[PDB]
Design a protein around this ligand. Sequence first.
Ligand SMILES: [Mg+2]
Ligand SMILES: [Zn+2]
Ligand SMILES: [Zn+2]
Ligand SMILES: [Zn+2]
Lengths: 38, 51, 258, 66, 52, 51, 18, 481, 115, 51, 47
Amino acid sequence: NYAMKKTQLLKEKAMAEDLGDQDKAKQIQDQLNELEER
Amino acid sequence: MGKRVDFSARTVITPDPNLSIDQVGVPRSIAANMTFAEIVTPFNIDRLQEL
Amino acid sequence: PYANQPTVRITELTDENVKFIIENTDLAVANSIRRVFIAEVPIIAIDWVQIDANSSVLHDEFIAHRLGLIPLTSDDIVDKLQYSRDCTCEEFCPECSVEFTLDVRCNEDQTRHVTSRDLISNSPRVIPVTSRQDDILIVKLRKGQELRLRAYAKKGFGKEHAKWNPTAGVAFEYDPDNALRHTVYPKPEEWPKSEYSELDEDESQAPYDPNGKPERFYYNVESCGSLRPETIVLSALSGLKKKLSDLQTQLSHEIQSD
Amino acid sequence: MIIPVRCFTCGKIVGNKWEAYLGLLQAEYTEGDALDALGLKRYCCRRMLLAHVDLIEKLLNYAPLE
Amino acid sequence: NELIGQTVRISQGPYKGYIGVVKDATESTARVELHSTCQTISVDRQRLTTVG
Amino acid sequence: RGEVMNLLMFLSTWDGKVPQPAILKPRPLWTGKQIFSLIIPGHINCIRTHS
Amino acid sequence: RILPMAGRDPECQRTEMI
Amino acid sequence: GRICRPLLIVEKQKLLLKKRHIDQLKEREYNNYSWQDLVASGVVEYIDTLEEETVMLAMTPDDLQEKEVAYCSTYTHCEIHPSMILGVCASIIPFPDHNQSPRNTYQSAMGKQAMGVYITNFHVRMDTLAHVLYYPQKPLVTTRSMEYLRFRELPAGINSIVAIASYTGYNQEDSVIMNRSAVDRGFFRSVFYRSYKEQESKKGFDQEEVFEKPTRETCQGMRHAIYDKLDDDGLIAPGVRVSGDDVIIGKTVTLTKRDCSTFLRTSETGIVDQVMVTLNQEGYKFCKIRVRSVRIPQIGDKFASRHGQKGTCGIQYRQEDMPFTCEGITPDIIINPHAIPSRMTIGHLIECLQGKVSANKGEIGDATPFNDAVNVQKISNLLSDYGYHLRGNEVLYNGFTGRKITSQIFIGPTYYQRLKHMVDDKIHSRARGPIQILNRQPMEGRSRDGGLRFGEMERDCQIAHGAAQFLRERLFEASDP
Amino acid sequence: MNAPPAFESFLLFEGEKKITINKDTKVPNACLFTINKEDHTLGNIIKSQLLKDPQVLFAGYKVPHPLEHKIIIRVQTTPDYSPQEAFTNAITDLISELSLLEERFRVAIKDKQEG
Amino acid sequence: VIFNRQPTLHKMSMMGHRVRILPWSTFRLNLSVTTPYNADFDGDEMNLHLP
Amino acid sequence: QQPMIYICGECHTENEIKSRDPIRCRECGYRIMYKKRTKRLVVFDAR
RNA sequence: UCCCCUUGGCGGUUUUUUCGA
Ligand SMILES: [Mg+2]
Ligand SMILES: [Zn+2]
Ligand SMILES: [Zn+2]
Ligand SMILES: [Zn+2]
């Protein structure tokens, strides 16, 4: 619930920490839903 | 030459023209902590005993 | 030696304020009545709040206080309820207090407005002034937050706490034009004319009146909506009458003990 | 933070008008016009809404206590 | 002793309907710290009722 | 008198006797200095220059 | 440079110091 | 580390900054036209104090580009706005050029003691010594520069009906009468939070510290306190009323067991607001407990105005007793007139009037110092439009008798601040409290329940009195026999 | 912490008399009446009523201390009429004024409302 | 009680006074007695010593 | 008669942390927890 | 002609910073 930061931090961390661009897009899909989810 | 003393109090001051020039308008809590040693005597024993 | 003969003249009468003029009475009596409307006029106000559950950021005392300031529809209720300290039954009951309930929780995503409509009352006669126009904003809640509490409104008067003050604003005035010069203007041309000045615009202030007492006490008693504004005046006269009757009673005790 | 229930000086209830005032504020009304519409003429009452800061809107930004 | 730490409601006097925890108790009075206000009043034990 | 009798309520050493008013007709009026004379104790004798 | 906040660093400390 | 400020560039006796820049900038809400464009375009420049000695600086282009008799004719820069020389605390002051500067300094200092909403997450924080006002307000008279302090959104004070009259003698020598009825309504009411940090820990091999409801049958060091108030966890529950020396955390260290618990500080009397439990850096149980305290402004609490008028609540009178105007307007605060002539805080008067005009006009007034477009005559013109005395005085009717007071009182909305110096944080009394274990003299400080020092200057005063028995008593019989 | 509860401003404790009669020593036919748990609201009206008495030589009142919920009324009358009976009358007639005013405001309202 | 303000410059900085109990947490003092102690009420505090 | 229920931080969910049990939420494992409101009586005058 | 209550004043300290009259 307050884990929007956790999901955002998880998505943000994965994008720079992960060498594939797909992970950032998959997290971005979750991130768009996150506006309603929190 | 300077010590800390029991039976001493400190408080924020405010004006009060209804008090006499030789009077101090003290708060109730301070009086509730500070005490004065009064010797018992037949003249005051009734008062101090009930007190 | 004896009592002067007071008179009354209602100039404006609404359900929110009364503008009236009292004559042939003392300046002290007129100001005392003014003071009584503010301090010595009983009303019912929230003065007891049991917060069963509160997850808002606002503190129970903060919440309670705001609730305490809410005007309640008390016109007949105050005349029948017993003063809170005075009730003979243990604790509280409808005979001496008004029970309130406010159990509200935000579940929708949009913020929930904790209005005065949300103030459940054990009585339909006593509610916040929300009959007919917006509501008293009590709190704003985010999704999942709640506020559950039990409360009692007590019969009290403005001298104890402003919550029991039924008035919005009392515009009291006497000698509208400065005939008694009770106030002397350094420059009378800089001064606006009174709202009740029954005099033409040529002169700045009325000429000095030496042998003439203060009469024509002009009022604008505006209610905060809790009590009807005319009942406020009746209540101030009855309350001042009460203080003097009580004093006469205690004096009879003080004198008969001879 | 949230609208005061009563006018500090006079005692008029001002807690039941903030939402009305915000509705008026959506339009290009000057802060004085809203009070005029709400009928608050004494400056003691007017000061209440003119000076109010609705910070509770900021307080709602915080994660809720389900 | 017995009612120290009990929650009592003041059932009589000016403090009727007040809630406070007791900090002292004698045969006649107890020192009640009010749960609401930051003051501690001494009141008669027959005027006190226990909510616990 | 309605005003004077309010002022004299705040004098401790006043003997309870109203001084003859400085202006008697058309209706009794007291001068501030007249009321102030009740404040002065005993028989004081002094001369100073005002600012 | 910025590392991605990754690693057990306390464990890394404790274990290498053995 | 070079302190510098941006300035307008002046090449001719004409601005580098033309309407095209302004037209772009009024729309800055939509387009982001900014300082970068202005400097990159060479219209503005950052002058450093060392460089400011070789620049010729104008105050305003609208006046320093015309001439009557040429004074300079060689300006190099122009001040953006001279009021920007004031700082953060100094920028809330209305009419600072109408006050004696030392008073401004005192307000600047007093702006640092005013209670208010210091942060939006104040309800989250388990920080020590927090104060927030119930109803702080946006000032009715603002400098156009306090918008940047976001004081409109984070105010510290209340627009209050100040009556500059020595009323009933208690509104005297910086003390000020306050409206009891307004306080009932929460006027200047604030909530004060204190936070207690506590962690259990390994005292040693034989002893380890743990939170527990201590019990007489096993715990040593127990006192007469109500441990019943902690729940079985050994921690006080949020929403439980506490008072001085009440147990807050039942810490116990095993021996049978020693009570090492934490009790509410001396003279506190608060309510547990919230209890947070966690593990510290070391992973030991660690908890921070926050106790809230509603501080009703009482007699003696220190208030200041935005003009250097430090003053204590002298006495509080009910609305029936406060003086009232021709209408039911009573002052919220009565301040002593003798505080003004000595301090020459005319900015105060102008603030009290512009606040009056702002509340009547229904608009936030501008009190930027070097306004030149808003002066007392113009403000008076504004006030004179509302059926009010153009200079603001009013016929007050005595609250006690209702009789008009012969002097028409200057009265109006003025932004007052409540300073943190509440009297209850200072009131102190003693009779055989703890003693310093070395010199066996009463301890020092109110937290240690100490005793007042009877210093040498006080002794010398007794020497001059020749009250030798008193002097001996104080320095021996009443100190360390 | 030291705020007296507001009810102490008007509530009489056990034994406290609402009014206390005291003789004046400085002059004849003079008393000082000490009202407990009172303020200017009740005192000025009584004072003003006493000024209407032709047999009252001196009348005025004070609240010895504003922080004290107690007032002192001083009454001094003619040799043929005690300050006590003057106080009795000053209560007897002030109540009358307020009762008649109650009746006149009540009728003026009932005549104004639906009439 | 003997009443003092900390910048104790002279003999009149420690006059003795009679006590009067009052509510509201503060040491109230007479207006004329303000000058000897040079004790304004903007937030000043005074020490009370009880013999 | 408590298993010692605590309220998580970021979860806002009651978690049972018995004595000597580590304060961690059942979900997200966040280490911050707050004690639940006391069940003791809470009443204010609203003054 | 089985007993059983038995609990009564504990305490950091240095240094530095901030603040009050
Ligand atoms: Mg000072
Ligand atoms: Zn009942
Ligand atoms: Zn108002
Ligand atoms: Zn969790």
